[PDB]
Amino acid sequence: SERIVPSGDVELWSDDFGDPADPALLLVMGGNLSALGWPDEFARRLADGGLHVIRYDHRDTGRSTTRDFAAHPYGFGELAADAVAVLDGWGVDRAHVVGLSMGATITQVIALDHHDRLSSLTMLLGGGLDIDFDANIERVMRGEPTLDGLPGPQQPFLDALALMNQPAEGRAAEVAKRVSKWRILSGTGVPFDDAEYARWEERAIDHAGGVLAEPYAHYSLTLPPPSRAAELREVTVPTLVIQAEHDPIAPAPHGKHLAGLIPTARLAEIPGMGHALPSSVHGPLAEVILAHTRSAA
Numbered sequence: 001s002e003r004i005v006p007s008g009d010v011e012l013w014s015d016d017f018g019d020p021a022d023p024a025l026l027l028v029m030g031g032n033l034s035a036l037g038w039p040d041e042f043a044r045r046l047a048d049g050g051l052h053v054i055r056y057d058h059r060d061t062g063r064s065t066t067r068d069f070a071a072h073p074y075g076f077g078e079l080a081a082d083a084v085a086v087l088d089g090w091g092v093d094r095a096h097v098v099g100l101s102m103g104a105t106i107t108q109v110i111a112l113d114h115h116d117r118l119s120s121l122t123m124l125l126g127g128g129l130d131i132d133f134d135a136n137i138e139r140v141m142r143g144e145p146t147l148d149g150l151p152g153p154q155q156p157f158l159d160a161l162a163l164m165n166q167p168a169e170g171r172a173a174e175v176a177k178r179v180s181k182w183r184i185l186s187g188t189g190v191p192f193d194d195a196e197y198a199r200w201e202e203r204a205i206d207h208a209g210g211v212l213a214e215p216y217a218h219y220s221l222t223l224p225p226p227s228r229a230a231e232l233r234e235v236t237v238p239t240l241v242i243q244a245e246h247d248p249i250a251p252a253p254h255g256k257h258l259a260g261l262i263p264t265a266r267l268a269e270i271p272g273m274g275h276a277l278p279s280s281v282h283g284p285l286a287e288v289i290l291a292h293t294r295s296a297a
C-alpha cells in the first residue's frame with residue numbers, strides 16, 4: 001500500500017512490501033533518488049525473507065513536497081528527521097534501517113540523533129561522516145590527494161557526471177541516458193542488464209508523473225561537519241557495513257573505515273559489485289541484510 005506522511009512542513013510519499021506484522025525495514029535511498037531507486041523486485045526479495053519493507057521519496061523527489069531549495073534550505077538534519085517521520089507515519093517504534101550512498105550519510109545522522117528509533121543499521125555504497133566528500137570530488141579533479149587518505153571518487157563516477165550533462169530529448173532518450181549512467185556506475189564485475197534497468201527507470205519516471213527531469217535539489221546540500229564522526233563511537237545498535245568490491249564512488253577501504261567508527265559494526269563485501277543495483281546482486285544483498293536483521297532481534 002501507499003501513504004502520504006507528514007514531516008514538519010513537507011509531505012512524504014511512501015509505500016511498503018510484505019506483511020505489516022513482520023519487523024520493520026526502512027530503505028533510505030541515495031541523493032536525488034526517489035523510492036523507485038530501490039527496485040520493486042529488490043524490495044520484494046527483502047520482504048519475502050520476513051520483513052515489512054518501507055521505502056519513500058525524499059523531499060524534492062518523486063511525489064514528495066518539491067520546492068525551490070534556495071527559498072527553503074535544508075540539510076541532513078532534515079533528511080534524517082524525515083526518515084523518522086516515515087516511521088511515525090507507519091506506526092513503527094524501531095526499525096532496521098538501510099542507507100545507500102548519500103543515504104548512508106543520512107543514516108549516520110539517524111544513528112546519532114534518533115538512535116532510539118533503531119533496531120539495527122545497515123549502510124552500503126557510502127562512507128564515514130569524516131569523509132569530506134564534496135571537497136574530495138574537487139581534489140581528485142585537480143590531482144590533489146584526499147585529506148582523509150582514503151581513495152576519492154574514481155573515473156567511472158566522473159564519466160557518469162559527464163553523461164548527466166549531455167542532452168536527452170523525449171522519454172526514450174531520457175531512459176536510455178539514465179541506463180547508460182547506471183551501466184557505467186555498476187561496472188562489469190557483475191552481470192548488468194539494460195532492459196531491467198530501463199524498466200526501473202520507466203517506473204521512476206511514471207512515479208514522478210511522467211516528468212523527465214531528474215531531481216536536483218540535493219546537489220545544494222551541505223554535509224555534516226567531520227566532527228560528528230567521533231560521536232559514532234556511542235552507537236550501540238548492531239551495524240552492518242557493506243562494501244561493493246568495485247564501487248567507483250566510495251572505493252575500498254571506505255567501508256572498512258566506516259565500520260571502524262562504530263563499535264558494533266561488522267563489515268561484508270559483495271564481490272564484483274559496483275555503485276548500482278542490478279538483479280545479479282539482489283540475492284547476495286538480501287542474504288546478508290536478512291542475516292543481520294535476524295541477529296538483532
Ligand SMILES: CC[C@]1(O)Cc2cc3c(c(O)c2[C@@H](O[C@H]2C[C@H](N(C)C)[C@H](O[C@@H]4C[C@H](O)[C@@H](O[C@H]5CCC(=O)[C@@H](C)O5)[C@H](C)O4)[C@H](C)O2)C1)C(=O)c1c(O)cccc1C3=O
Pocket residue numbers: 030031101102105125126127128129131132133134135137138218219220221222223249250
Ligand atoms: C552523483 C552521484 C552521487 O554523488 C552518489 C553519492 C555518493 C556519496 C555521497 C553523495 O552525496 C552522493 C550523491 O551526491 C550528490 C550530492 C553531493 N553533495 C552535495 C553532497 C554532490 O553534489 C555537489 C558536490 C560538489 O562539490 C558541488 O560542486 C560545485 C558546483 C558549483 C557550486 O555550486 C559549488 C559550491 O559546488 C555541487 C553543487 O554539489 C554530488 C556530486 O552529488 C549522488 C556522499 O555524500 C558521501 C559522503 O558524504 C561520504 C562518503 C561517501 C559518499 C558517497 O559515496
